[PDB]
Design a protein around this ligand. Structure first.
Ligand SMILES: [Zn+2]
Lengths: 219, 150, 481, 351, 352
DNA sequence: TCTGTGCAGTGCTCGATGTTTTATTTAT
């Protein structure tokens, strides 16, 4: 049995990116690999130019994300999408200089009434220990948020720690149970995969490599 | 669980002239709470259950326009209220707007005035179902049915 | 040289590290490769390049040989034989005929490499939302790929710059294989069909240049001149030394940092029979008109199964499959067929949206079929509203509410897809599809109300609104089995 | 603790404070019910462009950054990538005893060092360098005189920042503001009477509007604020934070305010320190029902929620609350402030 | 203090002072309760079209979209000062539309016009072509002194107060005005369930029944009116007027906000009621008192007394909680107390 | 000891222009 660090990602608004080079900023259904690394990298004091420990975090940690349905008054509330018409005045026209446009337009998608429970474990050749990752989520250095800085948390990042055989068995200890799980480690009775391009290329800033979740449906 | 709309329709139809007149002179739905004849009419339809009270007030207040103003006609969904008001060819579209925009109690007052004018032929259990909820959705569908008929 | 030296970004089919191979290593081994770039649109551009290359160097003489080369890699001797007469046309840095370029471009300034990076620039918001310096130094492979992408999939740089033969932003549709080698071979028309496809000047635009302001009959263009068509006057600059490519992140001896361009126009009359794109068939007057498919006001896509969505739209909605797809169906009518596909949604030079499915079942078809049904129900209802809005002499965005709502349809329903796909199996299929219907039914009502909400308390529009909502529920009722 | 949480409940009269590209009020689904929304970016700009901000943040004492005093630490920071010849040449041409240095200052100067290092190698100087880097030099000089604004709100949409360390986030994080209650918006059907037209108007239109008791949430990263102020003190950071508390209570977006005029101050302001910053939005996840207004039940729902989860969420730490209302108070663990100024002083004094 | 906040509590007898597309009373949800509403645009038009405005401020602007009709008005009004050719080109440059002899020429949208301002412009146009100065450079010159243009708004003050935008012509660049007065929609301090009047029209040639039967919504209500004036903005909008000039204009707004009532349905409902409480307060930041009535006022010997009381209590709560100490005065019929409105107005005229 | 015409040097606004769109219409 390995040690797991259990996290809770809850808030009225979330955003988990999909590939884009456009003014449209799309969200997926559950947290990304890159987004979870960034969240951890925020709790730790990692700066954007520190590629060394940026790569040390990525090589040390793997995730498992469970989608949690909001239950209210014994009624189920579904996750909905939200489109924000987001404008910027005096936005940069070039990457150097002070010339700017009057108005630019962007379109940003959010999730509403979404909540997630994240299982976290160490790779066989990890650098850090779950003990110091626990410290980081309890006392973050940079401000933690759900995808975008405008999206605060309504529940503490830290949920618990535990020991278990597989990520599914670990997430079982924490209500609410029943949601679909996406894991970096495969579990025995499941064979479905979820393709994604959310593996941050750390040697190539703001670029992403293809990878795959192992899909584990809830009962 | 659900109000027997036709049973209530029949009960109102074979009501004695006295009890009928006592109910008809009401000027708004809440005044039915002052009428003894009203309680006896709706008691076998679940009045003592608070769940049914607001619905029964609307239903009976619409009926109170008269025994012969609302003519029930069986399905061939069945004729909705919106289509039935348009079928009369007597009601201006502007009065339908004013009806569906009106707030509480005032809406029932204006509705009953429209029923009096239109003397509609409709599916009464279908109208009762509409009166049970009477949400914003039902009011918009009323107006759209009226318009789609004309 | 694209036929000789390494430039193809690959990694093992289920392996790890990226390695840069050459065309011979691909054609002459049972090694399983898959393209690997940071961008899906560039992976598709690369495959298109490879396919167009394999289309001129090795068309099978018959279907029998076609099936043979797929199961059996060529020998290095056969490969060298086939590529021998083509080496002269695939030089990046060359004296008189650079690959897809034009020597002697008259330009006052040097155009940055980002302009070939399709979407990194193009709109006034790009500098604010995108990461800078993606095109400071491009390797040889990425440069050729980018050039090929600009000539085929991307819109022109701006005024005075022309787009590809299929038009601006066409949808490219390839038959998918098990690995890169098979996929390339699978999309090469055999010699017989090649002749039936193209019944001319068969020399490239960078060897036999295009004359300014000339009118060109489409039938007067050879298949290699068309497949490797270059509508723009572009000339690369002198590259630089060893370092990281700012696009792919790989090390490269030569890295380009800029290029020259100039306004250049002409006219291709008629429609060139490009084999890589599906098209729409319309009959105006007595003549038959064809239009290559493109993501116009929406880009139909779902996570994990976008290729299936696009496939069904072609299969069902006057759409016709690509010629390379038509070939595969004839060669193997009973074999299952999935797409490798991509395209852009654009506002002239600006790229608004990218949708690409690049990876190397009947329930999924059923799911997509159901999805498109609700999509169509929504469109007919809101088009009914938009037309009535127009006929009522009203102005504003009310005349296109069916466009926005269609885009929102795919994005809102995409959120349902992961859970649907996760629970699909033999016994649960009918149940999860039924639940999907209820969800999509509810979504259509929500989106209808949302699209129409800004025009509440417009009494003159009540008959238009009522007709539109009645239309919606009529089509929604026809969808429940 | 490192984080300051700021919670505001503010009631607006009929208005349209934030709208989209169809001129409809912005909204959000929360707890399955529609809430009117004022976006993060709208709220933050109302603060950043306000007069109060220009006077207390834009004209701060820590505003100015002197490259002269930073020579030593810059000399050792860039000393392993660059030698003092270039580092000092750069430091002087940009301007014409410091302990620490702001991260973006190091990174942007390091970029200028890369340019002059390549300038000496390419064997060009005089005006040629100052011609090429004319706009770039002008850019950083402006930024060196807006240090508190940059530390608090982050860099501007056009800043001329060049490096990754130049991607400067704000030390304060502002959430989207949403109503505590469900809202069905009203519609204003309007005319425009033409002075030269006899029959009817020259234009007709509609405008969506509503009231709303909004919940505003913001947090401040103190260490980040200090670190981006060249290593300022906790006290100096707490002084900045006092201004944020004031603005989140009083500043309102200007949209539609000329014709709807919803110039309302907050009725409840609460500040609490923590190691983990949390929004108390789930106090209203079950949408607040009206009982003699929405404001009183909202403050009540906010207080009851705090009493229920604060302990388990680790919201032990200094907490204070200001309120215009006499609603039954939170747990006694929260110190009641009778005026806003007393609340702000409580923040200056570290709680 | 740059802002002058104005607070009015005014009670109306049964009436229908402002209605919508279906002739029903305008309303709004505030505190979860329906309030009867009078739009700010209705208030502003009632003031600018009033006799008091005409006597104390001057001429209201000309708001129109019909340039062909405007063309003819200017020719009749500016004919003895300029030749018809100059008048036509001036309108053409400002509106961005071709002014010929067409029966119908339409602007982009409804736009407020000031004759005196147009008169000032055609001077420039005349001098422009006289000095052989083309239109592109004429615009460049005029953009250099917008204050000289804004001095003409002293002939059209309602624009200086309420603003102007244009999307075509030189008005895009030269006529952009951000109004100095902010004003809210008047809402009732209490919940209202509107009354309905069931009426008939008796036909003198019809002995049986009436020729028309109908219904008309109406109600009473104690309304809260709020407005503020940005003095510095008002001075700038008047081409650099003095504070005394701005203060005097503000004083007329105070008077009108307390006495001017929209004319709608007044011929048959006659709710000609003056305000029962007026409150003026100088501040650095605009302050509305609306949240005094977020909890809807319950009746207690009327709505008026408990409304004024609710206003006073909330005023103290805000002043004590936010430590506000801007000058303030209060006139009432039911903080410096003013026995008469006139004393209140002198107070404002004298910078508080 | 300040200032004047030439620059060099360029920061621009100017305008014509590359492309390409359409899908519907209740219930009685
Ligand atoms: Zn590369």
């Amino acid at each position: 049995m390995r040690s797991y660090l259990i996290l809770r990602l809850a808030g009225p608004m979330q955003a988990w990116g999909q590939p884009t080079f456009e003014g449209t900023r799309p969200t997926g259904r559950f947290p990304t690999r890159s987004g979870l690394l960034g969240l951890l990298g925020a709790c730790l004091g990692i700066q954007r130019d520190d590629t060394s420990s940026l790569q040390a975090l990525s090589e040390s940690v793997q995730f498992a994300v469970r989608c949690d349905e909001l239950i209210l008054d014994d009624r189920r509330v579904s996750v909905t999408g939200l489109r924000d018409y987001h404008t910027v005045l005096g936005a940069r026209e070039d990457y150097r200089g002070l010339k700017s446009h009057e108005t630019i337009q962007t379109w940003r998608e959010y999730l509403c009434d979404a909540s997630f429970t994240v299982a976290l474990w160490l790779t066989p050749h990890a650098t850090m220990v779950i003990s110091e990752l626990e410290k980081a989520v309890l006392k973050p250095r940079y401000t933690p948020y759900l995808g975008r800085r405008s999206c605060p948390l309504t529940h503490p990042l830290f949920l618990g720690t535990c020991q278990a055989s597989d990520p599914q068995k670990a997430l079982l200890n924490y209500e609410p149970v029943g949601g679909d799980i996406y894991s970096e480690e495969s579990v025995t009775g499941h064979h479905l995969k979820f393709t994604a391009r959310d593996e941050p290329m750390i040697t190539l800033p703001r670029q992403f490599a293809s990878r795959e979740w192992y899909v584990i449906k809830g009962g | 669980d659900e109000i027997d709309a036709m049973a209530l329709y029949r009960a109102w139809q074979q009501l004695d002239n006295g009890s009928c007149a006592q109910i008809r002179r009401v000027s708004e739905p809440d005044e039915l709470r002052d009428i003894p004849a009203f309680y006896r009419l709706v008691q076998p339809f679940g009045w003592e259950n608070p769940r049914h009270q607001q619905a029964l007030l609307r239903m009976v207040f619409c009926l109170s326009a008269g025994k012969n103003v609302i003519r029930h006609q069986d399905k061939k969904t069945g004729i909705s209220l919106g289509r039935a008001l348009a079928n009369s060819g007597r009601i201006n579209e502007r009065r339908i707007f004013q009806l569906i925009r009106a707030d509480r109690t005032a809406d029932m007052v204006q509705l009953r005035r429209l029923l009096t004018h239109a003397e509609p032929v409709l599916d009464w259990p279908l109208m009762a179902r509409m009166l049970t909820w009477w949400g914003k959705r039902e009011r918009q569908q009323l107006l759209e049915d009226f318009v789609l008929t004309t | 040289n694209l036929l000789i030296d390494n430039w193809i970004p690959v990694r093992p089919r289920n392996g790890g590290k990226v390695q840069i191979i050459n065309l011979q290593s691909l054609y002459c081994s049972r090694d399983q490769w898959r393209l690997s770039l940071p961008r899906d649109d560039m992976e598709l551009a690369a495959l298109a390049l490879l396919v167009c290359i394999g289309q001129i160097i090795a068309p099978a003489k018959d279907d029998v040989e076609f099936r043979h080369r797929i199961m059996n890699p060529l020998t290095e001797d056969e490969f060298q034989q086939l590529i021998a007469p083509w080496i002269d046309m695939f030089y990046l840095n060359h004296a008189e005929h650079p690959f897809m370029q034009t020597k002697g471009v008259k330009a006052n300034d040097v155009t940055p490499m980002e302009k070939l990076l399709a979407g990194v620039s193009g709109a006034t918001n790009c500098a604010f939302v995108n990461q800078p310096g993606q095109g400071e130094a491009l390797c040889g492979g990425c440069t050729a790929i980018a050039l090929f992408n600009q000539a085929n999939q991307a819109p022109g740089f701006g005024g005075g710059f022309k787009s590809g033969l299929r038009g601006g932003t066409p949808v490219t549709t390839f038959v998918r294989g098990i690995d890169l080698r098979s996929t390339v071979l699978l999309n090469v028309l055999t010699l017989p069909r090649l002749q039936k496809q193209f019944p001319t000047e068969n020399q490239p635009t960078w060897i036999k240049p295009i004359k300014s302001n000339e009118s060109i009959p489409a039938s007067s263009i050879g298949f290699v001149r068309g497949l490797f068509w270059q509508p723009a006057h572009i000339e690369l600059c002198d590259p630089i030394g060893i370092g990281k490519c700012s696009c792919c992140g790989q090390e490269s001896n030569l890295r380009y940092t800029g290029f020259l361009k100039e306004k250049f126009t002409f006219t291709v009359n008629g429609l060139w029979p490009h084999p890589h794109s599906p098209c729409l068939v319309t009959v105006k007057k007595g003549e038959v008109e064809e239009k290559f498919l493109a993501f116009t006001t929406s880009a139909p896509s779902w996570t994990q199964i976008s290729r299936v969505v696009v496939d069904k739209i072609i299969q069902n909605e006057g759409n016709r499959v690509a010629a390379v797809v038509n070939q595969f169906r004839n060669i193997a009518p009973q074999s299952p067929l999935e797409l490798i596909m991509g395209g852009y949604r654009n506002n002239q030079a600006s790229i608004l949206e990218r949708r690409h499915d690049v990876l190397m079942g009947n329930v999924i078809n059923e799911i997509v079929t159901v999805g498109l049904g609700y999509k169509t129900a929504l469109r007919k209802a809101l088009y009914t509203f938009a037309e009535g809005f127009k006929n009522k002499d009203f102005k504003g965005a009310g005349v296109s509410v069916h466009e926005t709502a269609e885009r929102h349809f795919y994005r809102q329903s995409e959120l349902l897809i992961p859970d649907v796909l996760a629970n699909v199996n033999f016994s649960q299929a009918d149940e999860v599809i039924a639940d999907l219907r209820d969800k999509l039914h509810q979504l259509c009502e929500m989106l209808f109300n949302q699209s129409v909400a800004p025009y509440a308390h417009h009494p003159k529009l009540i008959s238009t609104l009522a007709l539109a909502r009645a239309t919606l529920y009529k089509h929604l009722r026809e969808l429940k089995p | 603790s490192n984080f300051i949480n700021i919670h505001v409940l503010i009631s607006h009269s009929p208005s349209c404070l934030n709208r989209d590209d169809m001129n409809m009020q912005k909204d959000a689904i929360f707890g399955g019910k529609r809430r009117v929304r004022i976006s993060s970016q709208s709220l933050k700009r109302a603060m950043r462009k306000s007069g109060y901000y220009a006077q207390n943040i834009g004209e701060s004492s820590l505003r100015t950054i002197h490259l002269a005093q930073l020579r030593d630490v810059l000399r050792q920071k860039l000393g392993e990538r660059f030698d003092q010849k270039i580092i000092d040449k750069t430091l002087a041409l940009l301007s014409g005893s410091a302990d620490a240095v702001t991260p973006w200052v190091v990174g942007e100067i390091a970029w200028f060092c890369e340019q002059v290092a390549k300038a000496e190698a390419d064997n060009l100087d005089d005006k040629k360098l100052l011609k090429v880097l004319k706009e770039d030099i002008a850019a950083i000089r402006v930024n060196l005189q807006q240090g508190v604004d940059i530390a608090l709100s982050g860099r501007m949409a056009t800043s001329g920042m060049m490096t990754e360390l130049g991607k400067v986030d704000g030390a304060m994080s502002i959430a989207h503001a949403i109503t505590t209650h469900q809202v069905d918006s009203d519609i204003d059907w309007f005319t425009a009477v033409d002075d030269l037209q006899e029959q009817g108007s020259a234009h007709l239109g509609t405008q969506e509007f509503s009231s709303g008791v909004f919940y505003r949430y913001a947090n401040i990263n103190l260490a980040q604020l200090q670190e981006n102020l060249g290593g300022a003190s906790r006290e100096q950071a707490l002084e900045i934070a006092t201004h944020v508390v004031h603005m989140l209570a009083t500043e309102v977006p200007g949209a539609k305010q000329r014709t709807y005029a919803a110039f309302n101050p907050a009725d409840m302001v609460m500040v609490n320190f923590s190691d983990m910053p949390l929004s108390m939005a789930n106090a209203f996840e079950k949408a607040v029902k009206a009982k003699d207004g929405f404001l009183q039940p909202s403050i009540q729902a906010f207080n009851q929620y705090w009493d229920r989860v604060a302990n388990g969420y680790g919201l032990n730490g200094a907490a204070a609350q200001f309120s215009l209302s006499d609603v039954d108070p939170i747990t006694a663990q929260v110190k009641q402030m009778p005026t806003l100024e007393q609340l702000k002083s409580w923040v200056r004094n570290n709680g």
